[PDB]
Scaffold this motif. Structure first.
Motif, mmCIF file in Angstrom:
data_model
loop_
_atom_site.group_PDB
_atom_site.id
_atom_site.type_symbol
_atom_site.label_atom_id
_atom_site.label_comp_id
_atom_site.label_asym_id
_atom_site.label_seq_id
_atom_site.Cartn_x
_atom_site.Cartn_y
_atom_site.Cartn_z
ATOM 1 N N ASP A 254 3.597 2.098 -14.391
ATOM 2 C CA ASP A 254 2.189 1.218 -14.046
ATOM 3 C C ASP A 254 1.930 1.166 -12.738
ATOM 4 O O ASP A 254 3.010 0.592 -12.173
ATOM 5 N N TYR B 82 2.535 -4.969 -7.076
ATOM 6 C CA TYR B 82 3.213 -6.079 -6.849
ATOM 7 C C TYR B 82 4.657 -6.056 -6.233
ATOM 8 O O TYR B 82 5.089 -6.813 -5.344
ATOM 9 N N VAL B 83 5.307 -5.221 -7.029
ATOM 10 C CA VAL B 83 6.992 -5.022 -6.316
ATOM 11 C C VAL B 83 6.989 -4.388 -5.136
ATOM 12 O O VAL B 83 7.626 -4.888 -4.249
ATOM 13 N N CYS C 52 1.539 -2.928 -11.768
ATOM 14 C CA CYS C 52 2.848 -3.660 -11.597
ATOM 15 C C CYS C 52 3.549 -3.088 -10.494
ATOM 16 O O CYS C 52 4.564 -3.968 -9.790
ATOM 17 N N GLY D 163 5.311 -6.809 -19.269
ATOM 18 C CA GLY D 163 6.191 -5.464 -18.884
ATOM 19 C C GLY D 163 5.224 -4.763 -17.972
ATOM 20 O O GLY D 163 4.039 -4.958 -18.107
ATOM 21 N N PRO D 164 5.403 -3.379 -17.845
ATOM 22 C CA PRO D 164 4.450 -2.465 -17.378
ATOM 23 C C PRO D 164 3.457 -2.150 -18.476
ATOM 24 O O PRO D 164 3.869 -1.735 -19.550
#
Lengths: 48, 48
Positions: free
Chosen positions: A7, A13-14, A10, A1-2
Motif C-alpha cells: 500500500d 508514513y514509514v 502506509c 494494516g496495509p
C-alpha cells in the motif's frame, strides 16, 4: 494494516514522505461544474 | 537554534530569519523507541 499489498499510503508514513491534499475540496469543484452546466444554454445565444 | 522548535527548523532550512508568507513542509517528527527487544532461541538444561 496495509489497505492493499505494497500500500502506497502506509508506505508514505514509514518513509516519512506525505501526499498533500488538493487546493479545492470535491464539493466546491462539483459546485463549479454544476453552475457551468446551468449557464451552458444561456451563454451560447449571443456574442459577449 | 533549529532543535528547539519547528519554526526554528524552518528558519534554519531557509537560512533567512525573515521568511515570506507560505506553507512549508519540514523534517517529520520521528517516533522514539521506548524499549529494546532481543529474541534468541533458549534451550537445554544442566542435569543434577
Amino acid at each position: 494494516g496495509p489497505a492493499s499489498a505494497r500500500d502506497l499510503i502506509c508506505a508514505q508514513y514509514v518513509a516519512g514522505y506525505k501526499v498533500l491534499p488538493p487546493l479545492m475540496d470535491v464539493n466546491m469543484e462539483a459546485a463549479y461544474t454544476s453552475s457551468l452546466l446551468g449557464s451552458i444554454a444561456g451563454v451560447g445565444w449571443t456574442a459577449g | 537554534d533549529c532543535g528547539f522548535n519547528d519554526l526554528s527548523q524552518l528558519h534554519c532550512s531557509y537560512e533567512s530569519f525573515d521568511v515570506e508568507s507560505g506553507v512549508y513542509s519540514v523534517s517529520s517528527f520521528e517516533a522514539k523507541p521506548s524499549g529494546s527487544v532481543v529474541e534468541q532461541a533458549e534451550g537445554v538444561e544442566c542435569d543434577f
